[PDB]
From a paper:
Opposing these activities is the [name]-[name] complex, a highly conserved multi-subunit assembly that functions as the major cytoplasmic deadenylase. [name] deadenylation rates and half-lives vary by several orders of magnitude and are highly influenced by mechanisms that recruit the [name]-[name] complex to specific transcripts. The [name]-[name] complex can also be recruited directly to translating ribosomes to elicit accelerated degradation of specific sets of transcripts. A major trigger for [name]-[name] recruitment to ribosomes is slow decoding, which is sensed by entry of the N-terminal domain of the [name]/Not5 subunit into a vacated E-site when the A-site codon is non-optimal and therefore lacks a cognate [name].
Recently, stalling of mammalian ribosomes on a highly non-optimal codon in an in vitro rabbit reticulocyte lysate system was shown to similarly lead to recruitment of [name] to empty E-sites. We therefore examined the Not5/[name]-[name] interaction interfaces in these structures to determine how alternative 13:22:46 triplet configurations affect Not5/[name] binding. tRNAiMet has the most common triplet combination (C13:G22:m7G46), while tRNALeu,UAA has a trans-Hoogsteen G13:A22 pairing characteristic of type-II [name]. The distinct base configurations in tRNAiMet and tRNALeu,UAA increase the intermolecular distance to Not5 and [name] in their respective complexes. This prevents the formation of the hydrogen-bonding network observed in our [name]/tRNAArg,CCG structure.
Numbering used by the authors: 1 to 231
RNA sequence: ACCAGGAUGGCCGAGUGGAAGGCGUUGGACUUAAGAUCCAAUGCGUGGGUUCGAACCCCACUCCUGGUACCA
């Protein structure tokens, strides 16, 4: 089986080459994504191009081998071909992203081509602003009803239950304003990149729970809502 | 002649079943002007077959390339 052994040895050497080439492709990818200057970006892109072309030649060889009937268990060849194609797709994505011109036809409508962290930050800020709007609407409603009940008490000169409800509304407005001011602090910190999005999402559910129902008697107010974060 | 691989923009040339890149060409900017530089636009060798659809997988044809043609 000298011919079979020769083919096997060539296969093993080619697979080792593919492994090393994928390692180098990843290294060049990280270099490119760490680049700070356009020249660095272009040079790393060219190195990635050269490495992926080498990988493409190795993959042509792998496809020719797996086409052959000499090999019987070619699972390793299949896996290496899959890996090479994954690297090729990654490089194609990288090159299409970089080559695109800002004001060319394709570039005109790139839509939200912002870092996913930036998109999530914008979403969290928008949700905080909407919550602030809802809290302000609730505060306005509560203050209007407080004025109405004060007028009613003045006209009637009684209805102690109305005085109790007015004090309850006063406390509710106090808590709504506290929530609004804490939201404003959180958003201001987020804008300056001083707070994490995960930190905001850890209290998102509790803030939703409060806004959903806060004046009802069966209100389980968790005082430890803003206590986890030293705001 | 036998075996193997190729043929895709104008030149190189990637591509795998749901026309890229470099160079080049053209329009504008920069400069007195050119060059460099900047912002942009255009650009499957052949037939058949499977497939819902093949640049891609199979059959066949043309052009090229690589290796072999030994003992008397």
């Amino acid at each position: 089986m000298a011919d079979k052994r020769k083919l096997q040895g060539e296969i093993d050497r080619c697979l080792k080459k593919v492994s090393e080439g994928v390692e180098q492709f990843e290294d060049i990818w990280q270099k490119l994504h760490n680049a700070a200057n356009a020249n660095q970006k272009e040079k790393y892109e060219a190195d990635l191009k050269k490495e992926i072309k080498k990988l493409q030649r190795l993959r042509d060889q792998i496809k020719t081998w797996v086409a052959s009937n000499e090999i019987k268990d070619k699972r390793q060849l299949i896996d290496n071909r899959k890996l090479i194609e994954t690297q090729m797709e990654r490089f194609k994505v990288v090159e299409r992203e970089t080559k695109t011109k800002a004001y060319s036809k394709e570039g005109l409508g790139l839509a939200q081509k912002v870092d996913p962290a930036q998109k999530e930050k914008e979403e969290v800020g928008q949700w905080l602003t909407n919550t602030i709007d809802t809290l302000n609407m609730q505060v306005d409603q509560f203050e209007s009803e407080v004025e109405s009940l004060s007028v009613q008490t003045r006209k009637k000169k009684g209805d102690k239950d109305k005085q109790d409800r007015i004090e309850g509304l006063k406390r509710h407005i106090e808590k709504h304003r506290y929530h609004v001011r804490m939201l404003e602090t959180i958003l201001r910190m987020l804008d300056n990149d001083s707070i994490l999005v995960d930190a905001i999402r850890k209290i998102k559910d509790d803030v939703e729970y409060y806004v959903d129902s806060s004046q009802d008697p069966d209100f389980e107010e968790n005082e430890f809502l803003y206590d986890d974060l030293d705001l």
